[PDB]
Design a protein around this ligand. Sequence first.
Ligand SMILES: O=C[C@H](O)[C@@H](O)[C@H](O)[C@H](O)CO
Length: 555
Amino acid sequence: EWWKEAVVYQIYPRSFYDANGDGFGDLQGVIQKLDYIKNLGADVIWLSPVFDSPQDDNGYDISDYKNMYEKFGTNEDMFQLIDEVHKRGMKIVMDLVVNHTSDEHAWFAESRKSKDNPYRDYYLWKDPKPDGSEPNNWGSIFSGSAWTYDEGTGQYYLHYFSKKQPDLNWENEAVRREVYDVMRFWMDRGVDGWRMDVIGSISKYTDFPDYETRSYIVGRYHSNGPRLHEFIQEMNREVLSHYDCMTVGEANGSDIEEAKKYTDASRQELNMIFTFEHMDIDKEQNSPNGKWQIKPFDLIALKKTMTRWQTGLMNVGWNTLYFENHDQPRVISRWGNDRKLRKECAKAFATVLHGMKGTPFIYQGEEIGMVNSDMPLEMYDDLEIKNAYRELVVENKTMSEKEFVKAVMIKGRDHARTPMQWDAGKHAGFTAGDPWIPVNSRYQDINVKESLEDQDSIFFYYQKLIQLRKQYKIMIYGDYQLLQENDPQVFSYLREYRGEKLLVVVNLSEEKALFEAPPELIHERWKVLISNYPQRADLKSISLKPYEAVMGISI
Ligand SMILES: O=C[C@H](O)[C@@H](O)[C@H](O)[C@H](O)CO
């Protein structure tokens, strides 16, 4: 159960470090930066997908599960990355993307040829409706229909995501055996675990029922299918149980109840899952514009959501802790202050997250306070944006252009994909060539070199938070309790374990705030473990400065 005590660093390798000088982040670049990650303190790295792919969705549309995409390097580089990680006492978690493949996968190239092709059923084909339209009104997460017509066989194929990401048919035993062969291949060669991409979708309602009704709908059939957990349970039986490993599911559509199904140790499925519920706090529940129909940051909602998850898996299953990844913007730009108070705010949000129960995940650049980009709309790369622009702005007109741009500047996935900022030199030292996407214009004041020089840096604050987690077992095994829950500025909570208490008090606003400990904690004595300002250790009453974070342990 080393995975309970781990801190995971997520690398998006095409934007981490270009060792070879082609403007593209590569595996040798990752190897060169292992020392830096270890120095931060993470003991597990999860690497976004580096398998062969036409890059329609930047790695998540795989055309070969057993070879690297050329621009990352070869398999000899990957096996070397694996050995270099293990050498440093670290673990490596690869991204398992098996809800769908690339339409350029060998399997799909055969499958599309005819109905009588051996691979036809590796994927999900349906006849049109009598009037020629799609088998149902299901939409793609990336806009338009979830169904694409093949003139050659007169049938549609299913894709929850891009037209170039046909969904696999998990009902087919051949397809599952194929996936397990892929997992076995890599785990035999030292991969310590998997992050499972949209694992919540692998089971379909095989009757493909319409939604009630404007034109295409994404909803409850797109996840949590009737055989989801059956399949995962088989995966565990056939594979995960043969190795000392770690598993984290990207559980799209997951609520607390579903989380227990995934994570309850007794069910022998997965160790932990990512949820979206705390990420969904700043969108309207059901608008045709989805994630792009944005709501202001609501602290109460954040507290309510995260707390439900802390208490829900408090004594059963296990939580993941994250605010950033390659699918999310920079949390400080999204929900806080990324200018004058950038460091305080980054530290605030870190403290809130790291003081909780579960496994923390640090997204590359989170640890130095990277921010959202001011790049123009035409400079974004993500297919999700271009597709949404076309649907929401051009065709349906459910968002003005100005409104669509505001939304992308807050929530566009590309805010997480501009290259990692290493120093203040050309392309922030990411590359000696021309980067695949431009570096954020603020890199000169926000980078690793300046961070490692400044003792007041966000980097050292993260380093210290990781150190404290290894030193104080209460941070890993304590329970959780929300305090002052109605406070519109302060997020405070308590952890308790074996007679010891850990009090976390974080002001997530730009104004002064007042924390007053509940009556029953008034006569506790505290040792301050960390704070983003200079700090008596007298915590019965704290006048909190803008974005001030305090973590204290009872003595
Ligand atoms: O909007 C977020 C994305 O839909 C993401 O969660 C998918 O996992 C990705 O495209 C890989 O398939």
